[PDB]
Design a protein around this ligand. Structure first.
Ligand code: MG
Ligand code: MG
Ligand code: MG
Lengths: 178, 179
């Protein structure tokens, strides 16, 4: 029912917002990609703007990325960001890149990312400069995914475990503090 | 002023345009308007829109700047450059890439150039095993930092550049030294 359709819609909307300029996207485009009709996107989400708001609520992402103890969190996060996924993931940064002169959509995304992603990590870190360190962790993780998935693509060297071996201890140093 | 200074204005305006709007939505007229020069002047110095684009995505000068000097202390020097609070569309490498899309010719040439001129150029310098991977990870860290601070965070980026160096440069230096 809603479950299978909504997931198809969210999936299509994320792709759309992460790959095309905000100002170009219609609900009809999203519906066509989702294999649904536009009216039931309006039923479940109300408007394009509200659909966008759902896609820039980062609370679920933070629940996935920061799950579990700080011990070994570096390696768990790098594993996830080292997976060779689509060039438009993570959605956070890719939707941001597609904003352009859509200033309100960019503003909402950035405010939510700071509160729901960065601060969610910063709250958990021991020691001094927790906020700065959380920004640096997300710099490393998002920078890795964008570099590998978008800039390098097939040119990317090394397997995910090799990425983890080199990069996770560095992420873990930021998590641990000092 | 001089030819050299007209060229500087054009390159500045062209980089901004290509890093902020889709390739297809960019005209030499608009670049000229932003630069404060005439479009025929852009043609004199660069030949065409495509050739201007090719100049922008030639990363050899960027590599000379970013990888200059001994490997000793290079991490700190590199984090110092990428920690500066520059425009949200810099670095041009990534921002112009974001404006390209579905492995268009523009995108293919940009990526090939970045791989050879940036990644491989750094990798050739590194001691120890897995040099290409380590160069990719260094650039991941540096570009990730600048995009996060300049584009995502903006006014709410935390810390001065020296504070960023203190935490981040030793990590960059570990990858340079051996991984
Ligand atoms: Mg993210
Ligand atoms: Mg770069
Ligand atoms: Mg070597």
């Amino acid at each position: 029912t809603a479950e299978q359709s909504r997931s198809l819609i969210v999936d299509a909307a994320g792709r759309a917002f992460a790959t095309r300029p905000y100002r170009e996207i219609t609900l009809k485009d999203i519906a066509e990609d989702a294999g649904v009709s536009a009216p039931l996107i309006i039923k479940y989400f109300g408007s394009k703007e509200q659909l966008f708001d759902a896609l820039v609520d980062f609370r679920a992402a933070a629940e996935i990325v920061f799950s579990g103890p700080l011990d070994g969190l570096g390696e768990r996060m790098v594993s996830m960001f080292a997976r060779p996924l689509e060039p438009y993931k993570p959605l956070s940064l890719n939707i941001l890149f597609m904003s352009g002169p859509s200033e309100e959509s960019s503003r909402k995304l950035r405010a939510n990312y700071s509160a729901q992603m960065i601060d969610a990590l910063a709250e958990r870190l021991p020691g001094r400069d927790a906020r700065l360190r959380a920004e640096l962790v997300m710099s490393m993780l998002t920078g890795l995914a964008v570099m590998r998935r978008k800039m390098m693509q097939e040119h990317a060297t090394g397997t995910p475990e090799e990425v983890v071996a080199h990069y996770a201890p560095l992420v873990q140093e930021l998590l641990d503090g000092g």
